[PDB]
Amino acid sequence: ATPRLQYFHIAGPGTREYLSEDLQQFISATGSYFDLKNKFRQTVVAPTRNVTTEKAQRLQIRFYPIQTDDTSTGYRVRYNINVGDGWVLDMGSTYFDIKGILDRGPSFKPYCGTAYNPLAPKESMFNNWSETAPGQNVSASGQLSNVYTNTSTTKDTTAAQVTKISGVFPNPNQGPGINPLRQVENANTGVLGRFAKSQYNYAYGAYVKPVAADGSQSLTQTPYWIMNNAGTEYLGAVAVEDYTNSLSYPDTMIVPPPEDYDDYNIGTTRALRPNYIGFRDNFINLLYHDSGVCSGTLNSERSGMNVVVELPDRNTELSYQYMLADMMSRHHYFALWNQAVDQYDPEVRVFSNDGYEEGAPSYAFNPEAVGAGEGYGPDLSQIKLYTNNTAANDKNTAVTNATTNFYFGTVPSYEIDISATQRRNFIMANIAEYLPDRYKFSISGFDATSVAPTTYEYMNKRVPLTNVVDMFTNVGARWSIDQMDNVNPFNHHRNWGLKYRSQLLGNSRYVNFHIQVPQKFFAIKNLLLLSGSYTYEWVLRKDPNMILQSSLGNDLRADGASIIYNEVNLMANFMPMDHNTSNQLELMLRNATNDQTFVDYLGAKNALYSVPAGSTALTINIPARTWEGMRGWSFTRIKAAETPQLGAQYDVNFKYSGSIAYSDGGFYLSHTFRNMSILFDTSINWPGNDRLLTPNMFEIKRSVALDTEGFTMSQCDITKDWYLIQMATNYNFVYNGYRFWPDRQYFHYDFLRNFDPMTRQGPNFALPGLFDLVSYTPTTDNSGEQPSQEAVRNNSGFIAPRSWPVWSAHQGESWPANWPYPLCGQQAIQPGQVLSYKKFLCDNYLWTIPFSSDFMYMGELTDLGQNPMYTNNSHSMVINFELDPMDDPTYVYMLYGVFDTVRVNQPERNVLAMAYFRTPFATGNAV
Amino acid sequence: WNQAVDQYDPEVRVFSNDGYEEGAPSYAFNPEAVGAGEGYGPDLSQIKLYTNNTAANDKNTAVTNATTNFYFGTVPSYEIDISATQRRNFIMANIAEY
Amino acid sequence: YNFVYNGYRFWPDRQYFHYDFLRNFDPMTRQGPNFALPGLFDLVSYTPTTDNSGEQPSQEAVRNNSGFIAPRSWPVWSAHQGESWPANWPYPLCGQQAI
Amino acid sequence: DNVNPFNHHRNWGLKYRSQLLGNSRYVNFHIQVPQKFFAIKNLLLLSGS
Amino acid sequence: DMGSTYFDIKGILDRGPSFKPYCGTAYNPLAPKESMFNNWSETAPGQNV
Amino acid sequence: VAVEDYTNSLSYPDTMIVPPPEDYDDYNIGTTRALRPNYIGFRDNFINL
Amino acid sequence: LPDRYKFSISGFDATSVAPTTYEYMNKRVPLTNVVDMFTNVGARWSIDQM
């Protein structure tokens, strides 16, 4: 409070108490148009007393396990958090510092495409050399680039280069080195090259590990002479290296032609499917949460009873996902808690087929501007240039030696439309490659039942059908491919969150990971422990499918993935606040009238109801209950293959490593709910007041083709009833008018941000014309040939055959396309020959129904949750579903509305007691 | 409410002519790596391969039958500047068209 | 962000600042081959010859995109030349044939 | 500069609006059009006919 | 309020020859990097050409 | 044939010649590349003005 | 890339012009192997030379 500081308002009183009172009224009055409040400084002074100890105190304490007890399924660690008096510990700052060794398995490509000769054409060959015995029957094809301007008819100019052949001198990188190739003479140039003796001659992805520090892929180089039909004339030399055993094709696969074409055709080489095997969002599935058989244990010393009890019907991971997404936007990337949300490519899921950016005719010209590619026109290779006679208007003088090139026509070029070429490459690799297995076929060397359908090389060696999706697939419609509307979009190499999460571990599969995992159990997520000695043990998963997330969802255990935890230490930060006040703080927190209370953010009992493949309906009957504070219902359906056994130490039937929609918020099956009904008693419908347009059921969607009375809103098949339910729940205003609500777009799990209605038209088949020339059923035979796909004849001569795998070389001839019936234009099909396909996708939403009498949010403890007709009187509801029938077993992830709270009471030193209470479902059993 | 505001492309209205992304000379090669497009240099179509003699530094033995093509020079290719191509197609189909 | 003892968390309230911590703090990780081993010859050279000539023959040891780009000793923006060849430099850090 | 920039195929709003109806020129459209007149845009009508 | 006071500066700026406002070139940009614009090399008109 | 003398009337603005090495200086002209894109605008907030 | 990872183009020579000049930066092509497609092919990794 020095007067020198006070004069400049650095440690002075403050603006409100030193300015003239009239001035404060003036600046406030004229504060909306003439702001003067920034011209009078004010400084906020720190407490500077009774807030921090001078005692030598550790600011950040590392806790290392007393006991470990490693096992094959989990990795337990037992800590002992000693909090002295005057110390106050927040478990919000507690986390597990985990460092170990991570093997992400060979099924891990951190990059699309290949790294070896990426610019090489797929069906290229690296200077072939195929022989039976050295010097015996030999076949060889390659470019001979290097020149040495030899004087021929003798060995001296050639043998000099041959003596250099044995080294790296052939040097495949260097070529002719002459820019005008026209200037070189055929008899005074010399020929050099370097050929490879190997099996599987493919330039694309060809890798031969070096043996010396200067290129030198091989140590033995037998030289061969090049001579014309006569042996007298010396023409060139050849270097040959044996790559039969030294050659490999990492991150690439051979796509052979069909079995009838296996001979006299080597097919093409394609890079393996990119796969990212990084950790999951927020380190989900890394601690044994939600498991009552292998839970953690936090308890004090005086009170030996464990205060961390976990139920198999709660969801710790998903609750954190919802809590964090409401706390902040999910597009923020926080690498500490590995906070990278699972996000697909919006251009890939809802495939807005807008054709392609049709531009001017674009060509690829010669390296020079002179040539005769497809040399139509007169030869002009033997012409003679004569000087003109301006008086006689004719030739007068012949030029002595006119060395002229002088070809005919424009620059020889090959035409490409990149905007269409890249469009099909985008469609057929970011969309086609992720089709379901039922729309794929083997590659003429692969056989089913040899490996499980959840392995990496199974997914690589099954090319999708080329007509189920292509450039013509609903050419003008923003339409998510209905063939993959039920395919997990987060299992995609464009999943930027997982893409970031995998690259935080490195580009190799041998990762010495060091990570920090937050505590997520709601009772101890933000617990503020007072003085005392606490022991807090927790067990960590070792399942590669659980702890690691693939971008393909393959079985990581079957792909050799594994993890070893070396050190798992517990970090805690302690405020160095004055012991005279922290004991006061801990004493006003030991007082029972003011003790910590924590709720699970999800607030939902979690029940998974099996729905088999062919089934389309599900009945959820429940025993008699009081529903004393129920919040409502939330439900989506999750594939059983993507959902682990609940409360399982180690799930053996779980052979999937993509995005577990149960654990995280990666919901993608909010569609495929036709309708649902609620009956609290055997026959008492919950709405039961003619609230809805269909009072006895929650008709989520109805087909617009069969629609007669309407009941479809937002230009899709969702119903008026269901649309009102969602907007009323999330946004609290439907009776004042439907509107968009930008205040909740950040939430990443609300309705409007991801409710995507789409519409296409499609030709009406089963008509005299309109033959539906696209086959969706593969022949599921060993050969990589699908003749049923050869009826589309689009891009006929410019793409690979439709029966062939897509990534094979093009062949055919230009031919009028026949398949895509023009739905628009002046040559369009008849208006009676078209249909409508109103549809909607809604990802990451998890449909909610509030247990509120007007469906509008009016408090966490809803309108009817305290209505003493349910609270006082027992009821046993039955919930009836009908769903779009899928082809694989799925659950129906039904989330009720529960008030799962904890009252943490710490009456004495190191006496810790937690009381758990859940209002509708207090017993927490299997329902 | 069919709420989708009319959005002109800002890169189209105010044409910020930043040229094009000039990289290395881009080349489109033959489907194979072997070809004789613009067949400059010696033909090498009727050649015969001879085994070497290390001691004599010369030809010693002819190969029985060498089915080889052995074209001259680098891999035949056509040069295309993708970035300039896209820039012009963008201009003509987005600015010149309208 | 004035809160560390209650737990490390992302703070979206300061991501506009253009000079705060979490906006521009970018951790990254790579693995790389371990050279100074019997194999793994480190076929990339980082020291140019520093001569008047426009040739760097020490760069000719990567043999990747052999017949499809300019020679590695040549300036990058020269015409492509060479012959197709299996690449040797980039040691596979992943996949079946990973080191 | 004096040509309507919203009459462009890169009109993302218009592209979305046209794609909401389908890929054909033959549309069995079903839409919900709001009321915009200010007197009755937000009028709270009491009981009555 | 000197918050509104600024300097209305106008003058002649020469940014120098070291100024390319655009990546790439503007003259035959689609031309291949090593092409020739229809060569004609001679010693004298009608001589060695 | 039409021949025009551009010996002194021709220039290569915004482009530079990237010649091959001296071992390839003859019998090869290499390629040409545009100069590095350089923007010489003023600084942010007219800093250092 | 830094000047220490570049070289002259067989026509340009150092010490002829200041290193802080434009045509010095133009006429110094960088080394092609220090940064290329294969440079940490799977890693989100800022180039340690940059």
Side-chain angles (χ1 to χ4, degrees):
Chain A
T2 305
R4 185 177 65 247
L5 262 51
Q6 291 184 356
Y7 180 63
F8 296 90
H9 310 109
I10 287 168
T15 305
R16 182 66 178 171
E17 54 209 282
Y18 90 86
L19 293 191
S20 300
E21 294 187 1
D22 291 332
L23 183 49
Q24 294 152 338
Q25 314 189 14
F26 185 92
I27 61 181
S28 178
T30 61
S32 307
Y33 41 73
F34 189 49
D35 206 59
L36 297 201
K37 305 172 211 233
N38 51 38
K39 298 166 176 59
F40 306 96
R41 270 284 300 153
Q42 202 202 311
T43 303
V44 177
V45 179
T48 193
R49 187 187 83 265
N50 272 350
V51 75
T52 300
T53 74
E54 197 274 332
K55 292 282 176 309
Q57 172 174 347
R58 181 70 78 202
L59 182 53
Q60 170 154 221
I61 297 169
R62 187 186 78 177
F63 293 101
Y64 42 99
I66 287 179
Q67 183 95 30
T68 293
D69 186 74
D70 188 3
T71 184
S72 65
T73 60
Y75 184 79
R76 178 187 311 296
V77 291
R78 196 209 288 171
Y79 298 99
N80 180 293
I81 303 100
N82 266 21
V83 180
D85 72 326
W87 280 8
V88 65
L89 166 66
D90 195 348
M91 321 275 308
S93 180
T94 300
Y95 61 90
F96 296 91
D97 183 288
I98 306 159
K99 60 162 68 183
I101 297 169
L102 179 65
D103 190 4
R104 289 185 281 191
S107 67
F108 165 62
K109 268 184 52 60
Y111 54 99
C112 312
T114 183
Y116 314 114
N117 305 319
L119 311 193
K122 308 297 187 291
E123 63 261 21
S124 286
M125 291 185 287
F126 48 93
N127 279 11
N128 291 318
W129 181 277
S130 174
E131 70 189 2
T132 69
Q136 288 301 108
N137 299 114
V138 65
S139 302
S141 63
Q143 289 293 111
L144 286 152
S145 74
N146 289 102
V147 297
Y148 49 103
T149 179
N150 55 352
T151 62
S152 181
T153 69
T154 195
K155 64 179 287 294
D156 294 329
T157 47
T158 315
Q161 314 288 320
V162 174
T163 52
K164 293 187 286 185
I165 283 295
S166 298
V168 179
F169 168 70
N171 205 353
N173 291 311
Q174 286 155 214
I178 63 177
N179 192 356
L181 270 294
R182 77 187 76 97
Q183 65 183 177
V184 64
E185 52 265 17
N186 298 322
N188 195 356
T189 180
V191 173
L192 287 174
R194 198 177 181 95
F195 301 135
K197 173 173 177 172
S198 172
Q199 163 95 350
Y200 284 160
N201 302 318
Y202 300 113
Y204 196 67
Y207 178 72
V208 173
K209 54 162 151 183
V211 70
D214 62 88
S216 180
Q217 297 170 356
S218 179
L219 286 166
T220 67
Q221 293 80 15
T222 184
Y224 274 31
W225 297 75
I226 287 177
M227 321 205 88
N228 45 354
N229 292 128
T232 57
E233 192 72 26
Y234 291 74
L235 280 73
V238 164
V240 168
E241 284 180 343
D242 193 0
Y243 293 165
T244 305
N245 307 115
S246 178
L247 186 150
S248 162
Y249 284 110
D251 74 3
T252 46
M253 65 179 288
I254 299 100
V255 182
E259 286 181 353
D260 300 288
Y261 276 126
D262 174 20
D263 49 341
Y264 60 81
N265 190 345
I266 61 171
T268 54
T269 298
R270 198 194 49 104
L272 293 164
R273 292 178 69 183
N275 202 3
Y276 304 95
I277 321 292
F279 284 107
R280 326 191 70 87
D281 188 5
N282 289 316
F283 296 116
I284 277 168
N285 292 126
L286 196 45
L287 296 173
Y288 280 97
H289 289 289
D290 195 0
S291 177
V293 65
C294 196
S295 70
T297 294
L298 164 65
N299 54 357
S300 171
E301 301 326 290
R302 274 191 51 61
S303 170
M305 61 79 71
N306 185 7
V307 310
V308 168
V309 65
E310 293 179 353
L311 294 174
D313 48 51
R314 77 167 80 255
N315 204 347
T316 295
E317 266 84 21
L318 182 53
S319 67
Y320 188 82
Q321 293 295 108
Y322 262 78
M323 174 205 79
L324 173 62
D326 213 335
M327 191 206 309
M328 65 184 73
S329 179
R330 294 297 286 142
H331 82 258
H332 295 115
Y333 274 40
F334 189 47
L336 171 54
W337 308 134
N338 190 359
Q339 176 178 348
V341 68
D342 296 326
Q343 65 211 82
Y344 57 86
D345 195 2
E347 326 280 357
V348 164
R349 187 69 195 277
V350 179
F351 174 48
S352 66
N353 198 348
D354 276 305
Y356 61 94
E357 189 73 25
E358 200 281 327
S362 68
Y363 308 81
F365 314 91
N366 278 100
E368 304 103 0
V370 187
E374 269 292 84
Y376 301 95
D379 50 352
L380 267 69
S381 67
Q382 296 291 29
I383 48 179
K384 289 181 74 73
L385 271 43
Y386 289 14
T387 315
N388 79 315
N389 194 358
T390 180
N393 205 8
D394 204 358
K395 62 183 189 73
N396 59 7
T397 300
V399 175
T400 56
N401 45 5
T403 181
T404 59
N405 200 4
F406 289 10
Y407 304 96
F408 173 76
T410 187
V411 185
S413 59
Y414 283 1
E415 178 164 357
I416 192 66
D417 192 78
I418 299 96
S419 296
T421 296
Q422 294 277 58
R423 187 58 176 165
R424 187 176 182 272
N425 292 322
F426 172 87
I427 296 162
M428 282 296 288
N430 288 301
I431 287 162
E433 196 57 23
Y434 293 93
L435 278 152
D437 185 75
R438 74 201 291 300
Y439 302 112
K440 294 189 173 181
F441 56 95
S442 302
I443 60 161
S444 74
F446 187 67
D447 49 349
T449 62
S450 67
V451 298
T454 60
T455 60
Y456 184 51
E457 61 91 21
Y458 182 90
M459 309 192 165
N460 292 305
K461 296 178 75 65
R462 278 195 67 88
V463 167
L465 298 176
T466 180
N467 300 331
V468 58
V469 63
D470 206 354
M471 282 204 47
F472 46 79
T473 304
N474 303 305
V475 65
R478 181 176 184 273
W479 174 260
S480 70
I481 310 300
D482 63 358
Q483 313 284 280
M484 293 182 286
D485 56 355
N486 297 320
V487 177
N488 196 356
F490 311 105
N491 303 330
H492 204 278
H493 65 266
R494 314 281 291 251
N495 194 358
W496 316 108
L498 178 54
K499 184 178 182 292
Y500 184 66
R501 294 198 303 279
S502 66
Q503 287 166 348
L504 279 163
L505 300 166
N507 45 355
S508 182
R509 69 195 191 99
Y510 297 132
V511 172
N512 293 319
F513 72 97
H514 182 185
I515 55 174
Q516 300 84 9
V517 177
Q519 179 47 247
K520 300 198 278 183
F521 186 55
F522 74 113
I524 69 169
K525 193 165 56 45
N526 301 120
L527 176 58
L528 172 43
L529 280 176
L530 303 178
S531 309
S533 175
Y534 305 97
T535 183
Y536 162 65
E537 84 181 5
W538 212 273
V539 56
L540 283 68
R541 297 184 196 276
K542 290 175 75 74
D543 194 4
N545 292 338
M546 281 275 188
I547 69 184
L548 296 168
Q549 176 180 2
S550 306
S551 75
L552 259 59
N554 51 0
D555 190 343
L556 280 181
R557 328 159 165 175
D559 290 333
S562 74
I563 197 172
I564 295 91
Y565 303 109
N566 294 127
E567 322 187 40
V568 179
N569 298 323
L570 184 134
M571 311 304 327
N573 309 150
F574 289 79
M575 193 193 162
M577 67 197 300
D578 209 301
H579 294 341
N580 289 323
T581 67
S582 54
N583 67 353
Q584 291 179 0
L585 172 51
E586 85 188 3
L587 271 162
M588 52 185 38
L589 288 176
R590 290 190 199 286
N591 186 328
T593 188
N594 56 4
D595 45 7
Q596 284 104 299
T597 312
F598 305 109
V599 70
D600 205 11
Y601 182 82
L602 198 67
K605 187 189 180 292
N606 300 280
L608 296 168
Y609 301 97
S610 182
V611 163
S615 78
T616 185
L618 170 67
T619 300
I620 302 176
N621 63 6
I622 196 167
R625 191 159 283 96
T626 196
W627 321 74
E628 271 195 316
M630 184 177 177
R631 296 199 301 117
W633 301 261
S634 297
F635 56 94
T636 42
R637 59 181 308 176
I638 318 296
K639 288 178 184 176
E642 304 188 353
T643 299
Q645 180 72 39
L646 291 199
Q649 190 172 238
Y650 179 79
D651 196 354
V652 291
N653 304 327
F654 186 60
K655 304 176 182 68
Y656 167 83
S657 169
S659 175
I660 297 89
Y662 175 70
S663 64
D664 61 16
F667 299 108
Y668 62 96
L669 295 175
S670 297
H671 55 94
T672 65
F673 292 99
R674 289 170 178 171
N675 66 37
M676 155 191 154
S677 72
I678 296 171
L679 300 95
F680 291 167
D681 263 358
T682 301
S683 62
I684 305 288
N685 296 280
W686 167 53
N689 285 321
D690 291 331
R691 296 306 192 214
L692 301 176
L693 293 155
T694 61
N696 296 358
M697 91 165 76
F698 287 80
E699 195 163 6
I700 297 168
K701 64 182 181 179
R702 67 163 74 247
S703 181
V704 297
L706 268 285
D707 184 13
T708 61
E709 71 276 349
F711 293 170
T712 54
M713 171 145 277
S714 179
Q715 306 176 1
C716 57
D717 47 347
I718 203 176
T719 52
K720 307 274 173 61
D721 291 331
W722 195 245
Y723 193 83
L724 175 149
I725 296 303
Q726 303 311 311
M727 311 275 318
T729 300
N730 290 311
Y731 310 118
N732 210 9
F733 289 98
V734 289
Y735 313 127
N736 299 125
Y738 292 108
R739 65 181 297 283
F740 197 88
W741 295 89
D743 315 308
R744 294 285 274 170
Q745 292 297 295
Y746 78 81
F747 178 49
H748 186 71
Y749 295 113
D750 66 326
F751 184 58
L752 289 181
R753 78 164 279 142
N754 49 12
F755 176 74
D756 272 304
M758 62 225 78
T759 308
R760 67 158 200 157
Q761 307 290 116
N764 186 2
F765 310 116
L767 280 190
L770 296 83
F771 294 103
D772 201 343
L773 292 82
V774 165
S775 67
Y776 296 106
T777 296
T779 59
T780 187
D781 71 288
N782 203 327
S783 67
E785 170 78 8
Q786 293 293 319
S788 71
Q789 306 294 140
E790 289 291 338
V792 288
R793 283 185 177 180
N794 200 354
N795 276 313
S796 186
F798 308 100
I799 68 180
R802 308 272 186 168
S803 65
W804 283 28
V806 194
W807 292 270
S808 62
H810 79 284
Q811 65 182 357
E813 50 173 353
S814 52
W815 198 241
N818 69 358
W819 156 235
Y821 285 93
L823 287 169
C824 73
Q826 43 194 320
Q827 279 72 242
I829 55 174
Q830 301 302 322
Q833 293 173 349
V834 307
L835 295 176
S836 67
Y837 289 99
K838 300 274 183 182
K839 185 183 79 178
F840 76 98
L841 301 203
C842 187
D843 300 332
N844 302 106
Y845 181 50
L846 172 83
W847 307 113
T848 72
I849 303 163
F851 186 81
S852 182
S853 51
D854 50 354
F855 298 113
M856 291 195 308
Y857 165 86
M858 263 155 59
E860 292 90 6
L861 188 153
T862 61
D863 214 359
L864 304 170
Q866 59 185 175
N867 182 359
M869 209 276 275
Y870 317 104
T871 80
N872 286 338
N873 297 115
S874 300
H875 297 290
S876 63
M877 39 193 300
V878 62
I879 304 167
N880 300 315
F881 280 101
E882 65 182 1
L883 320 171
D884 300 345
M886 274 155 93
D887 292 77
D888 53 68
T890 66
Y891 300 127
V892 170
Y893 183 22
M894 166 52 108
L895 288 84
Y896 300 99
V898 298
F899 266 121
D900 42 18
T901 62
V902 180
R903 197 176 195 267
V904 194
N905 174 267
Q906 304 182 358
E908 310 154 58
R909 191 183 185 273
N910 62 32
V911 173
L912 178 57
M914 279 173 170
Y916 290 75
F917 187 71
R918 209 165 69 189
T919 54
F921 297 88
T923 199
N925 59 352
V927 173
Chain B
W1 305 138
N2 201 1
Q3 172 178 168
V5 75
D6 297 271
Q7 306 170 209
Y8 64 91
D9 196 7
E11 317 284 18
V12 167
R13 182 71 193 279
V14 59
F15 172 47
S16 61
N17 196 349
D18 188 12
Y20 61 93
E21 180 94 20
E22 198 185 9
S26 296
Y27 290 110
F29 318 92
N30 277 102
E32 302 89 6
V34 185
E38 306 292 324
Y40 294 149
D43 54 354
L44 278 68
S45 178
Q46 305 319 127
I47 59 172
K48 291 182 74 72
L49 280 162
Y50 281 16
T51 310
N52 75 315
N53 194 359
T54 301
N57 202 6
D58 204 356
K59 56 169 182 68
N60 59 4
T61 299
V63 176
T64 57
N65 53 2
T67 65
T68 60
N69 47 19
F70 284 6
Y71 293 131
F72 172 77
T74 175
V75 187
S77 58
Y78 284 164
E79 179 160 359
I80 171 173
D81 198 84
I82 296 92
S83 62
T85 297
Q86 312 315 140
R87 174 51 91 231
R88 174 162 171 164
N89 294 329
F90 174 87
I91 295 164
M92 311 287 327
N94 291 297
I95 298 158
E97 193 69 39
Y98 295 88
Chain C
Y1 308 111
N2 219 33
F3 288 96
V4 285
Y5 307 137
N6 300 24
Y8 299 105
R9 62 176 299 281
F10 197 88
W11 294 86
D13 291 331
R14 299 294 273 153
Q15 303 302 328
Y16 80 101
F17 181 53
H18 191 83
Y19 297 106
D20 57 327
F21 184 52
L22 309 167
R23 186 183 186 275
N24 58 9
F25 174 70
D26 187 349
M28 41 195 88
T29 306
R30 83 173 177 98
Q31 313 287 121
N34 185 8
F35 309 116
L37 280 189
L40 290 81
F41 292 102
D42 193 17
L43 283 72
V44 56
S45 177
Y46 294 106
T47 61
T49 55
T50 301
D51 56 356
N52 198 1
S53 72
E55 173 80 4
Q56 299 294 319
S58 67
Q59 302 290 321
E60 285 280 325
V62 304
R63 281 185 178 178
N64 196 357
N65 285 308
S66 298
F68 304 103
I69 67 173
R72 310 280 196 171
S73 59
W74 285 44
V76 187
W77 292 271
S78 56
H80 78 90
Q81 61 207 18
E83 48 183 355
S84 50
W85 203 239
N88 66 0
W89 157 232
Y91 279 95
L93 294 173
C94 77
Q96 295 297 109
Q97 272 94 51
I99 49 178
Chain D
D1 49 17
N2 295 320
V3 179
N4 196 357
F6 311 103
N7 305 149
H8 203 280
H9 63 266
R10 287 181 181 267
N11 192 357
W12 313 111
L14 179 55
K15 185 183 287 188
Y16 177 65
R17 290 201 301 288
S18 64
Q19 282 164 346
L20 280 161
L21 304 179
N23 53 2
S24 183
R25 69 195 192 97
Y26 294 130
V27 180
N28 290 294
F29 74 100
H30 182 186
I31 55 174
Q32 299 84 16
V33 177
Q35 174 71 350
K36 307 179 141 198
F37 190 65
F38 72 111
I40 59 188
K41 194 185 40 196
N42 279 288
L43 173 62
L44 186 70
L45 279 177
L46 284 179
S47 178
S49 179
Chain E
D1 187 350
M2 311 275 288
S4 62
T5 46
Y6 60 92
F7 296 97
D8 194 10
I9 299 170
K10 59 160 67 182
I12 292 141
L13 180 63
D14 190 355
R15 285 186 274 191
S18 70
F19 171 56
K20 265 184 63 71
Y22 53 103
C23 312
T25 193
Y27 305 116
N28 303 316
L30 291 166
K33 266 65 150 193
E34 64 267 21
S35 293
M36 322 275 288
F37 48 93
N38 280 51
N39 299 327
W40 182 282
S41 173
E42 72 180 358
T43 62
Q47 278 300 115
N48 290 318
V49 59
Chain F
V1 161
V3 170
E4 281 173 335
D5 179 23
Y6 296 162
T7 309
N8 63 7
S9 178
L10 187 149
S11 162
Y12 279 104
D14 78 11
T15 43
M16 72 166 298
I17 297 166
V18 183
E22 287 83 351
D23 299 336
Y24 293 93
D25 169 10
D26 298 337
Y27 62 79
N28 185 349
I29 67 171
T31 63
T32 183
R33 176 191 152 281
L35 321 181
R36 298 247 304 267
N38 213 24
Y39 304 94
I40 321 292
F42 287 115
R43 295 194 185 276
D44 190 6
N45 292 312
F46 294 113
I47 277 168
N48 293 116
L49 183 62
Chain G
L1 279 156
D3 202 0
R4 52 187 320 264
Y5 299 110
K6 292 183 174 180
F7 59 102
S8 301
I9 56 159
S10 75
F12 181 66
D13 71 273
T15 45
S16 65
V17 70
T20 66
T21 56
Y22 185 53
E23 63 97 15
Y24 182 93
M25 311 176 144
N26 294 318
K27 303 193 175 265
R28 279 192 71 89
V29 65
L31 297 174
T32 178
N33 302 332
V34 54
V35 169
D36 203 358
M37 293 205 62
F38 47 76
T39 307
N40 299 303
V41 70
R44 179 179 177 277
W45 174 260
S46 67
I47 312 291
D48 62 358
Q49 287 89 36
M50 298 266 280

